[PDB]
Symmetry: D3
């Protein structure tokens, strides 16, 4: 019953990549346990990147993630956390391999189209933060 949190960033949404990305997870065999289009508020974003509150790029992260609506989701499946990280590819598109989501759709680190939980613990945190309990099915 392992699960992970995935967010299609503002750039992924405006470029119309939502369906293509979801399709990759569905053909893989993962179950969509939650899904919604939402607008991340300034405060919510800052809480998410709370650990980087002192970083110099913190303001940048917050700005981009709130620049427009995002699509949040929870995926379930065998070792889905690590499998999704593998599917997304390296955080910086230049190092992401062809076949991965960022390797196929992204060109810059600032607009790298998608985010996926790094660990099961981050997943639980992110799910509790972006989704209400009743939104999980």
């Amino acid at each position: 019953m392992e699960r992970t949190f995935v967010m299609i960033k503002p750039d992924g949404v405006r470029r119309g990549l939502v369906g293509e990305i979801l399709a990759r997870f569905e053909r893989k065999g993962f179950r969509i346990a939650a899904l919604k289009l939402m607008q991340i508020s300034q405060e919510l974003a800052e809480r998410h990147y709370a650990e980087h509150r002192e970083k110099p790029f913190f303001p940048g992260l917050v700005r981009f993630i709130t620049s427009g609506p995002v699509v949040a989701m929870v995926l379930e499946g065998p070792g889905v956390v690590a499998e999704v990280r593998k599917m997304m590819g390296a955080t910086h598109p230049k190092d992401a391999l062809p076949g991965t989501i960022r390797g196929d759709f992204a060109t810059t680190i600032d607009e790298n189209v998608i985010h996926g939980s790094a660990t099961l613990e981050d997943a639980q945190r992110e799910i509790a933060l972006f989704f209400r309990p009743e939104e999980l099915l």
Copy 2:
């Protein structure tokens, strides 16, 4: 401006067709104004199909539409109501032409993969019934 309500039925979600269908709307150029995976409550299903509460097939429509989660959404764009209707194809898959969502993905009337508002008026009503006002972006 104009908006329409679309729902990928339980069979469409079960068969992993969410991304593929969503991708068709994004390729078309429509904007996703709202989106969420949800379980239709008995009340919502009855409210939705109230028109047939007398019909003998009513209990059937309700059981099916609540048989599993669906993906509800609101699409926005020029004449989106009539366009989506055309994109989905005939209600009965037997009459739905290839190239159409039902024409390419459905085989029976009971499990016809998707629903789309019939008119502008139906759209306003359905959107208000399936989504909380704050969920429209």
Copy 3:
């Protein structure tokens, strides 16, 4: 229950369209009851086109249908005979509409990529002619 016979002609196989076409039937929801790559014998071709053995274009139909291997198959599902007919599109690619197999892949009548049983009766006959009974699953 209902079954229909489908054959991807020598041109369709030669052009590497087998998977793409098969995928359309699988996406539609039909079940593959039988499948095999085969070389149509002179006898089988004549038996199949017996109706035109008198016509002047007969020798042509036979030479083409035996010009290379074909992929024969039996598709199963609700009203599969009429549905497949619709999915293939008009026999003459000039009349075949986009979204259709012939509409998307064929350009001439002689090389129209695929064949599908015209009626339930034709289906029984074709299936018995192209497949050994034990090959139907």
Copy 4:
């Protein structure tokens, strides 16, 4: 033998639809006789839409067709003029059926993604206007 002129308009190029559209023609079996990314000059646009130089919407057609680069091409094959017309679908996306290029990618008449010669005669004229003779292969 027969040839037709096709142009992916500025909106189609801007939205990254060049490969997808080109792929449909290649899958169909037509041959690419000519191809080039180009910026339509004011003279070329006026020459092309000369028929409407009197109309009030003329200045509009010109500004749009020259708003950005287009991908011009010449397709060759059996009855390619009428076939491409069918593949593109109705000029007004509202009338264009799913499965069609405009039916799948366009939403408004002003930005209808593509143009294709209406007749054999129009094809000869357009090809001579958009391409240098040595560019036809």
Copy 5:
């Protein structure tokens, strides 16, 4: 004239992945020399996994491979044995890279969608076992 044996397992067939998989081999440029839908008998399966007759997972392999119809095929092309192993990806999906068949469609080792000969010798053995000579074209 190198060739290899590939089998789309019962899970790959029931999930409707036959066409998509074949399409990958066709676009790659490999030739389909044989193809058929078949039901592996208990005895046949045991002979195939004869080398593992003493293994503890032998009963499991036999059970799954006979749980439903499979699609067997022979592919021909330059170094096709090693190339197909590369295309399928690691035997355990968790270690299979995005872009490969198992990396894109599978989540568990038990249901890893496909099988491909490990060596030319295994290929000859598997072809002689699953196909009759006359079925090779």
Copy 6:
């Protein structure tokens, strides 16, 4: 404003892979700055492979590259030279990974479907050689 030169070789063109390949670059987010179908002359080809004028495979390179029309293009984007080399995959298809262009579409080194500049310097040279200045947009 980095840019690179890409050529879809004669084999890629005759196999109808132009659109599919362009689509990969467009979905990635690269900008098409130039594009054209052309026939490489004997002299032009020899100049291109001038550095290999003394190699034993020089005659072979020249022959294949001139065996039919090719599609030349210039792509722009962040680190596009290295990114495109990554997308194309290893020069020899056998070593190209699934997900890359050669890994997915090619089987032999002689007909490896595509070429991309090795360095920014090679790119400038190739662009100056295959394109006229006015063809860059």
